[PDB]
């Protein structure tokens, strides 16, 4: 070789327009979620009964220029994305812009994130190794039984001390949890259904997908 000039983190930056629409939806959700008795009834479990006035909803900070993760090069353990990163086709795909569809949104006391499910195009161009994740775009057939949008999620909320990377891990587990047979709390709404895992983690399934144009970005640094 020559030098360690390979990518470490991959992702697509959502268009300033989409973030505006998506943000408006997220905010409206938190408002409706709080008004709902179902949530307020389990608020003790969500807030652990130790805050002040359910300010945790406002405590979370939402950054303007939000970004969405895609594949983590890591190093070698991930042969999948590894081959992908070594594909000039994907490297050039960066200047490109594809519309991502939002399947559901997740809300964690530690961090907040949204479930995004790309199209067949992004899936076909997705590495097999990374697919190992709880839910991958390629696992669509499996998605029918288990939620989707974990492999690719957008950062919305983050605590003071925790890393954004942890947000993704939670999402992957959330979907796998429902399919795991747990599915503790379940509620069907006019726009979607909200399910929460036995310990916690609350996510609403946006029955009506939300598309948003985004560009592919890459970062090569340690």
What are 16's two structure tokens? 């300033």
Residues 6+ apart with CB under 8 A from 161: none
- Gap between the Cα atoms of 39 and 46, Å rounded: 9
* Residue in the block written with tokens 């696992």: 139
DSSP letter for 131, please. G
What are 114's two structure tokens? 């949204």
- Gap between the Cα atoms of 134 and 201, Å rounded: 16
Classify residue 29 as left (phi > 0), alpha (psi -120 to 50) or beta.
Answer: alpha
What are 96's two structure tokens? 């490109």
Superfamily assignment of 1-222 in CATH?
2',3'-cyclic nucleotide 3'-phosphodiesterase superfamily (3.90.1740.10)
Residues 6+ apart with CB under 8 A from 217: 10, 11, 12, 13, 67, 94
Give the helix/strand (H/E) hosting 188.
strand 185-188
- Gap between the Cα atoms of 184 and 63, Å rounded: 31
Give the helix/strand (H/E) hosting 97.
strand 97-107
- Gap between the Cα atoms of 142 and 147, Å rounded: 9
Count other C-beta atoms under 10 Å from residue 55's C-beta.
10
- Gap between the Cα atoms of 139 and 132, Å rounded: 9
CB 111 within 8 A of CB 159: yes
Q: SS3 letters for 20-89?
A: HHHHHHHHHHHHHHHHCHHHHHCHHHHHCCCCCCCCHHHHCECCCCCEEEEEECCCCCCHHHHHHHCCHH
The counts of H helices and E strands in the chain are 9, 8
The method of structure determination was NMR
Ordered by start, the domain boundaries in the chain are 1-222
DSSP letter for 141, please. H
**How many Cα atoms sit within 13 Å of 103 on the Cβ side?**
21
Q: What does the longest C-alpha to C-alpha distance in the chain come to? A: 61
- Gap between the Cα atoms of 173 and 181, Å rounded: 13
DSSP letter for 213, please. E
Backbone angles phi, psi at 112, to 5 degrees: -120, 140
Q: What is residue 194's three-state secondary structure? A: strand
- Gap between the Cα atoms of 169 and 132, Å rounded: 12
CB 194 within 8 A of CB 102: no
- Gap between the Cα atoms of 42 and 95, Å rounded: 44
What torsion, rounded to 10 degrees, do the Cα atoms 135, 126, 24, 95 define?
170
Q: Which residues are catalytic?
A: 67, 153
- Gap between the Cα atoms of 38 and 82, Å rounded: 44
């Amino acid at each position: 070789g020559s030098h360690m000039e390979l990518p470490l983190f991959f992702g697509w930056f959502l268009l300033p327009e989409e973030e505006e629409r998506i943000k408006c939806a997220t905010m409206d959700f938190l408002k409706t979620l709080d008004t709902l008795e179902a949530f307020k009834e389990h608020i003790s479990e969500f807030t652990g009964e130790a805050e002040k006035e359910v300010d945790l909803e406002q405590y979370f900070q939402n950054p303007l220029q939000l970004h969405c993760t895609t594949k983590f090069c890591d190093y070698g353990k991930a042969e999948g994305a590894k081959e992908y990163a070594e594909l000039q086709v994907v490297k050039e795909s960066l200047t490109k812009s594809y519309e991502l569809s939002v399947t559901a949104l997740i809300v964690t006391p530690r961090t907040f994130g949204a479930r995004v499910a790309l199209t067949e195009a992004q899936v076909k161009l997705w590495p097999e190794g990374a697919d190992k994740e709880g839910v991958a775009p390629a696992l669509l057939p499996s998605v029918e039984a288990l939620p989707a949008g974990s492999r690719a999620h957008v950062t919305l909320g983050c605590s003071a001390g925790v890393e954004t990377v942890q947000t993704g891990l939670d999402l992957l587990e959330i979907l796998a949890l429902q399919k795991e047979g747990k599915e503790g709390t379940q509620v069907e709404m006019d726009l979607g259904t909200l399910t929460y895992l036995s310990e916690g983690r609350w996510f609403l399934a946006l029955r009506e997908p939300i598309n948003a144009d985004t560009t592919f970005t890459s970062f090569s640094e340690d």
